Amino acid sequence: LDEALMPKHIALIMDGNRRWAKDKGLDVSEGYKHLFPKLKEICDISSKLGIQVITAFAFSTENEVDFLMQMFEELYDEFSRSGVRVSIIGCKTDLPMTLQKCIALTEETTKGNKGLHLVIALNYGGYYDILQATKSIVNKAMNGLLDVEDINKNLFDQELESKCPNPDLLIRTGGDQRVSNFLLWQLAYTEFYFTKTLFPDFGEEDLKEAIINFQQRHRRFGGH
Amino acid sequence: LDEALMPKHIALIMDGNRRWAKDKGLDVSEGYKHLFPKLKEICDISSKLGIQVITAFAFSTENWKRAKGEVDFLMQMFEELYDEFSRSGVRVSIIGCKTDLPMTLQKCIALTEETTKGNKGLHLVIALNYGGYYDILQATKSIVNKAMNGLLDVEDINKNLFDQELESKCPNPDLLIRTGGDQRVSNFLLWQLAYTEFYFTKTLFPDFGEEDLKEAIINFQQR
Numbered sequence A: 001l002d003e004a005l006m007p008k009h010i011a012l013i014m015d016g017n018r019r020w021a022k023d024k025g026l027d028v029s030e031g032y033k034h035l036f037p038k039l040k041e042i043c044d045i046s047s048k049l050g051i052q053v054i055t056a057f058a059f060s061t062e063n064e065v066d067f068l069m070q071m072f073e074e075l076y077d078e079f080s081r082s083g084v085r086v087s088i089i090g091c092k093t094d095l096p097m098t099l100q101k102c103i104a105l106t107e108e109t110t111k112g113n114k115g116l117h118l119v120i121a122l123n124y125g126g127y128y129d130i131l132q133a134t135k136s137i138v139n140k141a142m143n144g145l146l147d148v149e150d151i152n153k154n155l156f157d158q159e160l161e162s163k164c165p166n167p168d169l170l171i172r173t174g175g176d177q178r179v180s181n182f183l184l185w186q187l188a189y190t191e192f193y194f195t196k197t198l199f200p201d202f203g204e205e206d207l208k209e210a211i212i213n214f215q216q217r218h219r220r221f222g223g224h
Numbered sequence B: 001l002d003e004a005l006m007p008k009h010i011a012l013i014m015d016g017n018r019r020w021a022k023d024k025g026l027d028v029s030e031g032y033k034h035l036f037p038k039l040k041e042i043c044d045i046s047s048k049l050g051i052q053v054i055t056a057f058a059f060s061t062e063n064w065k066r067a068k069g070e071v072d073f074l075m076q077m078f079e080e081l082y083d084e085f086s087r088s089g090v091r092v093s094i095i096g097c098k099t100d101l102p103m104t105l106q107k108c109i110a111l112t113e114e115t116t117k118g119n120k121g122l123h124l125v126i127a128l129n130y131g132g133y134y135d136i137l138q139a140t141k142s143i144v145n146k147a148m149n150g151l152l153d154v155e156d157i158n159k160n161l162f163d164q165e166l167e168s169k170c171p172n173p174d175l176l177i178r179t180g181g182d183q184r185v186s187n188f189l190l191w192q193l194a195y196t197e198f199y200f201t202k203t204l205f206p207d208f209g210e211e212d213l214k215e216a217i218i219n220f221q222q223r
């Protein structure tokens, strides 16, 4: 592990919680109860390593489920007094009104934090991020606030919910090799790391192993 | 393992050509020269398997950053499109910003598209001066133009409409194969790859063969 070659932004697809529980013969709720505690541990480790941002896929727009929407309220107690600045991205208006308030509370109470920035993607999809940006651009163009000529990569970077700097590394647990409608635009040149390890079993040595693998890779960005 | 039930659409990042050449103590041009013959070979195999679409990444919007000599060689070599695919039985389309390519390449592309448009087998989409950012931006511009001319409302902007404004269309790739060992999509079909299964192989593109293709397809199937 070389401290100089640390990625600044890690994206995380936190897959395998359901399978973890079912394979163990536990109630599926037991898998979900590991989600935020494990994410908090990963934030703690990452922050020590000098990682600046984590964007973590918690619930896609395509994803029982009454349980999940209630559990997602315990963001507050994990993070509110934690030193982590927390942002939530996704379709917030589709959520039960009380989860909406819990999310806002978590965001408001941590917005002053100067440590690691945790971005939780909850009812999020890449398609929907791109579409909301497109709509924002169209409304602006309709109101004479920009021209088609102004529609470029940087404009789009500013209208998307997940902002620059983009992820350097994406880690997906659970064994499947796909992005599953996570950060599509933002992943254009991200290094991908896939592991069979299920999210509840993913520890500090697994995280370190992913980062070491990242550091060995040559990033060329269309050049060299 | 292999069930005779196949992906409709494979996306292909044709990578590792320069390293292939330099491993053999050759000029990079020699690596590039295998690009289209290899692509044509992959189309033949895939067609026998019953694959309907291949989208192959030939030149990105970022590849302009390379040495002027290499970019010049590539832009010249790409004119061999017509000789390579005219009589191949493949229906060929190009996606990407055609208007910024040399005029001779543009007319060569148009001719290759025109001459193969009646082919009823495999559809080969070649991404040339293409990027995912580019695709999404041109789609967005088109939607903005239509909204400003009263041809649609902001409430009509949904996944289904966007699917139809993008250059790479439905069905989206079932499987992405990238040669050369690097584990990234490098600004290829970003929107279109949202649920695609990724297969990354260390095998360099000029060495890619029928066994490497069947291995990828097994992974897709095991899913």
Ligand SMILES: CC(C)CCOP(=O)(O)OP(=O)(O)O
Binding pocket: A013, A014, A015, A016, A057, A058, A059, A060, A062, A063, A176, A178, A180, B195
């Ligand atoms: C758990 C998570 C949001 C990451 C994967 O979400 P998903 O299971 O819906 O994606 P897939 O169905 O494609 O595997």
Ligand SMILES: CC(C)CCOP(=O)(O)OP(=O)(O)O
Binding pocket: A219, A220, A221, A222, A223, B013, B014, B015, B057, B058, B059, B060, B063, B182, B184, B186
């Ligand atoms: C194959 C292609 C036309 C573009 C993708 O390959 P690339 O070598 O430009 O991608 P990287 O620089 O990210 O390795």
Ligand SMILES: CC(C)CCOP(=O)(O)OP(=O)(O)O
Binding pocket: B014, B015, B016, B017, B018, B019, B020, B035, B057, B058, B059, B063, B074, B180
């Ligand atoms: C087809 C193309 C121009 C890009 C893929 O080949 P490449 O030049 O990137 O080969 P290398 O990865 O070895 O540099």
Ligand SMILES: [Mg+2]
Binding pocket: B015, B016, B180
């Ligand atoms: Mg390359």
